[PDB]
Write an enzyme that holds these catalytic residues in place. Structure first.
Site, PDB file in Angstrom:
ATOM      1  N   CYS A 139       0.800  -1.220   0.000  1.00 51.14           N
ATOM      2  CA  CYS A 139       0.000   0.000   0.000  1.00 51.14           C
ATOM      3  C   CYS A 139       0.836   1.275   0.000  1.00 51.14           C
ATOM      4  O   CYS A 139       0.307   2.342  -0.330  1.00 51.14           O
ATOM      5  CB  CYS A 139      -0.940   0.001   1.206  1.00 51.14           C
ATOM      6  N   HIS A 141      -8.531   4.467  -3.042  1.00 48.33           N
ATOM      7  CA  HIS A 141      -7.181   4.031  -2.688  1.00 48.33           C
ATOM      8  C   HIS A 141      -6.582   3.266  -3.861  1.00 48.33           C
ATOM      9  O   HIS A 141      -6.696   2.034  -3.941  1.00 48.33           O
ATOM     10  CB  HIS A 141      -7.204   3.177  -1.421  1.00 48.33           C
ATOM     11  N   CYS A 200      -0.280   2.454   6.248  1.00 51.32           N
ATOM     12  CA  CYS A 200      -0.180   1.068   6.682  1.00 51.32           C
ATOM     13  C   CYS A 200       0.060   0.182   5.466  1.00 51.32           C
ATOM     14  O   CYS A 200      -0.480   0.433   4.385  1.00 51.32           O
ATOM     15  CB  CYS A 200      -1.447   0.628   7.419  1.00 51.32           C
ATOM     16  N   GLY A 207       0.593  -3.805   3.662  1.00 49.40           N
ATOM     17  CA  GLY A 207       0.343  -5.231   3.742  1.00 49.40           C
ATOM     18  C   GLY A 207       1.567  -5.988   4.220  1.00 49.40           C
ATOM     19  O   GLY A 207       2.707  -5.558   4.033  1.00 49.40           O
TER      20      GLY A 207
HETATM   21  C1  LIG Z   1      -5.130 -12.519  -1.662  1.00 52.78           C
HETATM   22  C2  LIG Z   1      -4.339 -11.379  -1.128  1.00 52.78           C
HETATM   23  C3  LIG Z   1      -3.243 -10.731  -1.545  1.00 52.78           C
HETATM   24  C4  LIG Z   1      -3.018  -9.742  -0.569  1.00 52.78           C
HETATM   25  N1  LIG Z   1      -2.010  -8.773  -0.508  1.00 52.78           N
HETATM   26  S1  LIG Z   1      -1.697  -7.858   0.823  1.00 52.78           S
HETATM   27  O1  LIG Z   1      -2.944  -7.349   1.305  1.00 52.78           O
HETATM   28  O2  LIG Z   1      -0.659  -6.946   0.450  1.00 52.78           O
HETATM   29  C5  LIG Z   1      -1.047  -8.958   2.035  1.00 52.78           C
HETATM   30  C6  LIG Z   1       0.322  -9.159   2.112  1.00 52.78           C
HETATM   31  C7  LIG Z   1       0.832 -10.005   3.081  1.00 52.78           C
HETATM   32  C8  LIG Z   1      -0.015 -10.658   3.982  1.00 52.78           C
HETATM   33  N2  LIG Z   1       0.498 -11.490   4.954  1.00 52.78           N
HETATM   34  C9  LIG Z   1      -1.392 -10.439   3.881  1.00 52.78           C
HETATM   35  C10 LIG Z   1      -1.909  -9.595   2.914  1.00 52.78           C
HETATM   36  N3  LIG Z   1      -3.912  -9.777   0.384  1.00 52.78           N
HETATM   37  O3  LIG Z   1      -4.777 -10.841   0.027  1.00 52.78           O
END
Ligand SMILES: Cc1cc(NS(=O)(=O)c2ccc(N)cc2)no1
Ligand SMILES: Cc1cc(NS(=O)(=O)c2ccc(N)cc2)no1
Ligand SMILES: Cc1cc(NS(=O)(=O)c2ccc(N)cc2)no1
Lengths: 396, 729, 402
Positions: C91, C358, C388, C390
């Site tokens: 993000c 977003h 924030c 991912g």
């Molecule tokens: C499917 C999917 C991809 C994705 N990308 S994410 O939201 O960037 C993400 C990255 C790492 C972790 N541990 C959890 C979510 N989220 O869900």
């Protein structure tokens, strides 16, 4: 102010494309294996001080999608504050991660950064990520899209490199790659790949055909569009392209990864690390997207002006062997001595794992500078799309 | 790359050869070393010779048939050999299954159709042999089963089962239906899912129908003769590959849904199966077959497999082979059973006894209560009619064997008494005294008692010989163990008659000597008390239930403490406190007793009274009581999660060692299976006794490491975690 | 050592997902429109001094594959020596591109760098790139993979944010976003997207629901239109957070970030770089920081990242005039506000992603240029932008107006 130092530079062996040993190994598990080797070398290293993990990946899809760097941080159990970012600048993605990590240390907002790349070309083939530059008819006309094999043949046609001339460098790369393996040069910097049980999967470069002959290279043969006509439309002063590049005088399609630890002098002092080389300067340049593979010459000259050095000041020249004509063009322009250019083999013999190549040949020069007790080395690569990179390192 | 196990420098042969004038080779597997064809060292060399012969004579062979000269087809592999695989032996384990699958892959890619003549049980490696064939015909005989039960022993289908099943049904269907739980299939259900293609009536028709299928396949399908659907150019994996958008949208939920069902337990077998399945669907068949070997060697050299292979194979063998049975005794058949009391226990005993074909008389204190106890059996048949697991013809005869009554004389002709009245000694003397004379003279007088010793209960009858303890577990229709308790004056024939009765109703028996608390209810007492003491110490109830589920238990401890009823738990402590103070001693109470008594003061003493540790409404269970945190100051103690897990596991393992020392249990097999099938001990441990010898902690592995971890718990929580001298030196 | 300055920071309007206006627009054309706009602002700028074009992209597949930055350099006719590279840090890719561009200037080996991001989520949905953390059962177990939807509900469960609390912030965002648009705050930084004939396609953030009411947000159902609707992720998350009994699913589609298409471009250069090209600096990159957090909650990353960037600049929470946190989920902002005691008048004063959308790879550079224009409008000095990430990461950046 803050100078960037290379403390560790390791890499995996390169498994060939067809019936390769690394075809059953996910590209993520290749990066985790190199992280475990750095743990073995420095078990008391405080991984909390590692602020970022930068990886290069040209085809970040499938097994290589979803920020493979961050996946390498979490799957290996590294601290969650260790970052993890993926970048892609085509063939120089591996060296771009090293340069960006060094520039992050020079800015002062990063203390200890891991850099490198990964590319499992047998699981994620080249071009799997699509691309507007090639798969959109509007863009594919504006940029005059042509595969890099034709740009290489266009180089040999203009410069006058015959089929025997490019096959001569192909044989030369195979000889110097086997001599490096036989001499134990790659003994410490090539971490063999093992399965989850400890059984050996690969411990050498499979793509190497060390018993290559000049008669067998000439038996090889040199592709569904008018890319020749498209290329000659811009280069209108050449009548016909002499296709001299085959599978034996071009870069090898393999799987592999490479890791490089980059930090400041205070980072290694606090963590008990000894610097092996210092990143002197980096430079980025380019050339027209048709010939594409002439980026090294202006990029190398740019990195020499910054450091205030010349060809006579550099001890070793390492250019990625994407195609034989690319190295002969780079050697002819700067009058590079033949005994300073790709002295420990090249990509024609060992392979070209795209996103990990720039980080592999980076650590390869760190070893040869320390083995010969030399001083400087200049690493450069030709980039798809008509870009060029260059990096000067100094042994410490 | 060789079909044989040695490239260097003397086993028997288990496969016959027969080529006909048509060119069909009949490979009849007949291992002389046993009654069942297993995947031992002899089969590997025997098949290695045959496959080599199928290639050298490929110009005079048109088809292959794989048959068996046993009652079964090919049931499993050599568990005696796999249980000894050290981590050093990972190279030999990898090469073994790689050699086994190299044989099957050549048989599969031979250019000639190969038909399987499944004449019986094709379990484990046997089904893997059948899946390598191009066509499968099963004889619809009684007792025949087909599946891949490698996960139940801690392993995985390493002879191509995972790779081939995913090639036939896809990642999702092959995992859930066959691979994850290793479910066994009847021949009819096997053809229904895709494991088998055709069915015949008798076994004498298999080889004829096999050769007939070869002739028609070579006639009407000459190009695709002997080619699997995945060895063709246009193979599309059903459900898609991991690179398919439809499957990629749900693929991340498979590890989470699996972790949802495993409750976070340390069971690496289903986790490794899902990994090998998804990784296999990304590459070619041969590359996927090799990945399957690496994950397999990862499990065989581990510790969980050695626990599950010890319990669910070796320990289960000795029990079902008469290890706990008294020796030199005949079988006295049962004609009519009489269950005393129609509660949750008595009704469950009447169902599992009538489901086996026994006439049961269900007596209680009134017809309103006895007939309502039979309703427990009716409400379960209405569930089996909706799911389609039984017929109305066979279900009406099931409920017809249950005769609910309130008059004691209707117990005439009963040669097997199973009492399930309230936990009161003089009541059982009163209950047995009313009917001891009405029943047949040489009748078994059983008692479903939880703590009262059988020696004391036997005083209320005239013939103390035939008085025995037949301990069941609710719900009786699902709990598969029967704890048999031997009183002091209890004879040996009563042990064997109840032993045979347990096997007659499809359950597993253990023999236990008479003692306060027996083995099941006593050891499970140390389990719920460690959680209750943990709650009194100030630990969050949510962390307690999470630790109980991640240990491997089927139900969390506080949830179990509501179904075990806290008023009975208060009676056990008062009884134990009485026995010590009756003997002129000083009783050291358990820290959980104060937690039990506090719940009695608040009126929440378990599910029976609508309120316990959980809130209960509309029959189901709502959630944890909000007043539980402020009562015990939950959160003021936050121990590590592994300490909560170990405190519950070690309390039972240490208490089990006392039962083996005090003479309560006579074998380590009854200790393991009795704890798994009885009190719900985690199966990955292989039993409460196997948990000691196979403990794998961060400090080490083995009995020496178990003692070390017990001393860590002892110095930090109390002296109750001190290992007995039977584990020291 | 060398100070990096922001000379121009523009963006495109964010087009909604379903029946969006930017759906017919290739994401490469969104970046070329911003490149051509910079030439419209400074026609005499020697583009040969631009040494790199860095774009953030979380789903670099299809129309966004093959170094889309290089395609922008070549298709827009930029000098062939201007490089081009994509980066993916989930993000915060849009801000990581600017922070890397700033760090590239501080090293002295790059003078004028274009930074930003692009993400056309109506053409390249999230997860189109795959990933080992999602599509590998071995990795999906070691890394307890739980989507951002559950981590946001887990934060509101632990901190005690009711359904009305997260919906109150959703109305707060929609209100302040409409006041900024109606007040003309965005008039000069939101470049309207046009076609090959100059016809208008979109000139506003069409995901905004300005007439939003508290009663309307209460009628929305909890999130069950993605990977979360499948199952197990609640059980997996509580296996680590074992002291929590029930996860209170409070985040819906009206209190979470919007799925939109957009792009942003920022020109970062040294003091001598803008002097040679005749560029007036607008802000100065004071400091950046990157600290992660637990990968299950995965959204508490902004809290440590904001402290590390304040400690590097010798500043406290009281020295920052404007706070800009990406409105990925309402609980992520309430947690950030509750932790560092952020005053309400300084936090996302011009709306956020809940109202305007977003666009993953472009959000970091969009909300960056938002504060550069709000610092000049309020005539304030300092602003801190954070997001924030991912996987449990965080990125924070402090800018100072010049
Ligand atoms: C499917 C999917 C991809 C994705 N990308 S994410 O939201 O960037 C993400 C990255 C790492 C972790 N541990 C959890 C979510 N989220 O869900
Ligand atoms: C297929 C495939 C991928 C690929 N990428 S490439 O070789 O990097 C490339 C990039 C830009 C241009 N203009 C030409 C080639 N080229 O072909
Ligand atoms: C399972 C299983 C067995 C079992 N035994 S039991 O006899 O029902 C029992 C009763 C009271 C107490 N305190 C402990 C055990 N209870 O659950």
């Amino acid at each position: 102010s803050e100078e960037a130092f290379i403390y560790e530079a390791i890499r995996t062996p390169r498994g060939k494309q067809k019936n390769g040993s690394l075809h059953e190994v996910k590209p993520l598990s290749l990066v985790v294996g190199l992280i475990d080797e750095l743990r073995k070398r420095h078990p008391d290293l405080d991984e909390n001080l590692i602020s970022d993990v930068i990886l290069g990946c040209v085809s970040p899809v499938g097994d290589q999608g979803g920020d493979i760097a961050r996946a390498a941080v979490l799957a290996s159990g590294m601290p969650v504050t260790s970052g993890g970012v993926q970048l892609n600048r085509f063939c120089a993605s591996g060296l771009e991660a090293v340069n960006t990590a060094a520039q992050k240390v020079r800015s002062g907002w990063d203390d200890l950064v891991l850099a490198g790349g990964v590319e499992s070309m047998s699981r994620v083939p080249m071009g799997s990520d699509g691309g507007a530059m090639g798969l959109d008819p509007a863009t594919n006309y504006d940029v005059m899209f042509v595969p890099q094999s034709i740009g290489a043949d266009l180089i040999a046609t203009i410069e006058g490199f015959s089929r025997e001339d490019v096959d001569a460098y192909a044989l030369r790369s195979q000889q110097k790659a086997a001599e490096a393996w036989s001499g134990g040069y790659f003994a410490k910097s090539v971490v063999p790949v093992r399965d989850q049980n400890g059984l050996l999967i690969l411990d050498h470069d499979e793509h190497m055909r060390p018993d290559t002959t000049k008669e067998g290279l000439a038996k090889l043969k040199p592709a569904l569009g008018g890319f020749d006509d498209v290329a000659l439309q811009k280069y209108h002063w050449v009548e016909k392209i002499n296709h001299v590049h085959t599978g034996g005088n071009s870069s090898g399609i393999v799987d592999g990864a490479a890791l490089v630890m980059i930090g400041s002098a205070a980072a290694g002092k606090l963590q008990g690390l000894t610097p092996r080389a210092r990143i002197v300067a980096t430079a980025t340049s380019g050339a027209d997207p048709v010939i594409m593979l002439t980026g090294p010459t202006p990029a190398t000259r740019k990195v020499l002006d910054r450091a205030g050095l010349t060809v006579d000041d550099i001890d070793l020249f390492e250019l990625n062997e994407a195609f034989a004509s690319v190295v002969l063009k780079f050697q002819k322009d700067l009058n590079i001595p033949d005994e300073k250019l790709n002295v420990n083999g090249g990509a024609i013999a060992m392979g070209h794992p795209l996103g990990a190549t720039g980080a592999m040949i980076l650590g390869t020069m760190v070893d040869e500078l320390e083995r010969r007790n030399a001083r400087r080395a200049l690493i450069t690569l030709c980039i798809g799309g008509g870009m060029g990179v260059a990096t000067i390192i100094e042994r410490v | 790359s060789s079909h044989h196990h040695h490239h260097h420098s003397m086993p028997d042969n288990t496969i016959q050869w027969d080529k006909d004038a048509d060119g069909i080779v009949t490979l009849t597997m007949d291992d002389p070393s046993g009654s069942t064809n297993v995947m031992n060292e002899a089969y590997i060399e025997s098949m290695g010779k045959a496959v080599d012969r199928l290639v050298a004579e490929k110009d005079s062979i048109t088809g292959v048939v794989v048959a068996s000269a046993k009652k079964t087809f090919f049931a499993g592999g050599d568990v005696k050999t796999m249980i000894q695989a050290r981590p050093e032996d990972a190279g030999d384990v990898f090469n073994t299954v790689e050699t086994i699958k190299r044989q099957l892959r050549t048989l599969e890619t031979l250019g000639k159709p190969v038909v399987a003549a499944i004449n019986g049980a094709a379990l484990g490696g046997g089904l893997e042999i059948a899946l390598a064939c191009h066509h499968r015909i099963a004889a619809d005989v009684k007792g025949s089963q087909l599946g891949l039960p490698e996960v139940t022993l801690g392993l995985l289908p390493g002879g191509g089962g995972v790779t081939r099943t995913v090639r036939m049904f896809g990642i999702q269907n092959a995992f859930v239906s066959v691979l994850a739980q290793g479910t066994r299939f009847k021949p009819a259900k096997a053809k229904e899912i895709g494991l088998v293609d055709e069915l015949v009536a008798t076994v004498e028709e298999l080889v004829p129908a096999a050769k007939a299928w070869i002739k028609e396949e070579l006639k009407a399908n000459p190009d695709g003769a002997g080619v699997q659907p995945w060895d063709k150019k246009g193979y599309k994996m059903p459900g898609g590959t991991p690179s398919s958008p439809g499957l990629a949208a749900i693929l991340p939920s498979f590890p989470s849904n699996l972790r949802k069902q495993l409750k976070g337990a340390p069971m690496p077998a289903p986790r490794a199966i899902l990994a090998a399945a998804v990784e296999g669907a990304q590459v070619d068949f041969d590359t996927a077959s090799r990945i399957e070997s690496r994950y397999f060697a990862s499990l065989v050299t581990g510790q969980v497999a050695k626990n599950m292979m010890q319990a669910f194979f070796f320990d289960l063998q000795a029990i079902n082979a008469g290890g706990s049975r008294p020796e030199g005794i005949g079988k006295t058949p049962i004609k009519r059973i009489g269950v005393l009391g129609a509660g949750m226990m008595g009704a469950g005993i009447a169902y599992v006894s009538a489901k086996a074909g026994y006439e049961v008389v269900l007596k209680d204190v009134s017809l309103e209560a006895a007939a309502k106890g039979k309703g427990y059996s009716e409400k379960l048949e209405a569930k089996a009619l909706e799911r389609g697991r039984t017929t109305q013809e066979r279900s009406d005869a099931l409920l017809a064997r249950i005769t609910p009554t309130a008059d004691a004389a209707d117990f005439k002709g009963v040669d097997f008494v199973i009492e399930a009245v309230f936990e009161n000694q003089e009541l059982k003397h009163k209950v047995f005294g009313e009917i001891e004379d009405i029943v047949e003279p040489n009748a078994i007088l059983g008692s479903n008692t939880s703590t009262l010793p059988i020696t004391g209960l036997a005083t209320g009858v005239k013939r103390q010989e035939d008085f025995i303890g037949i301990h069941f577990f609710s719900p009786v229709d699902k709990m598969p163990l029967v704890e048999i308790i031997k009183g002091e004056k209890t004879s040996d024939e009563a042990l064997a008659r109840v032993f045979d009765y347990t096997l007659a109703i499809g359950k597993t028996p253990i023999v236990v000597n008479d003692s306060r608390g027996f083995f099941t209810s006593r050891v499970i007492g140390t389990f719920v008390n460690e959680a209750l003491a943990m709650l009194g110490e100030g630990v969050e109830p949510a962390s307690i239930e999470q630790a109980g589920s991640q240990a491997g238990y089927p139900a969390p401890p506080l949830q179990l403490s509501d179904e075990l009823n806290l008023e009975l738990m208060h009676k056990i402590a008062v009884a134990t406190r009485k026995g010590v103070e009756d003997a002129g001693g000083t009783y050291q109470p358990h820290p959980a007793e104060a937690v039990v008594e506090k719940m009695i003061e608040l009126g929440r003493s378990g599910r029976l009274k609508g309120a316990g540790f959980y809130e209960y409404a509309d029959g189901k269970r709502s959630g944890l009581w909000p007043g539980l945190r402020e009562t015990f100051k939950s959160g003021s103690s936050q121990p590590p999660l592994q300490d909560m897990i170990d405190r519950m596991l070690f309390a039972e393992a240490l208490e089990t060692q006392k039962c083996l020392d005090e003479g309560v249990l006579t074998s380590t097999a009854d200790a393991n299976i009795g704890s798994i099938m009885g009190i719900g001990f985690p199966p990955w441990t292989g039993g409460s006794a196997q948990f000691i010898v196979g403990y794998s902690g961060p400090a080490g592995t083995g009995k020496a490491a178990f003692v070390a971890r017990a001393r860590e718990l002892a110095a930090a929580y109390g002296d109750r975690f001190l290992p007995p001298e039977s584990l020291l030196s």
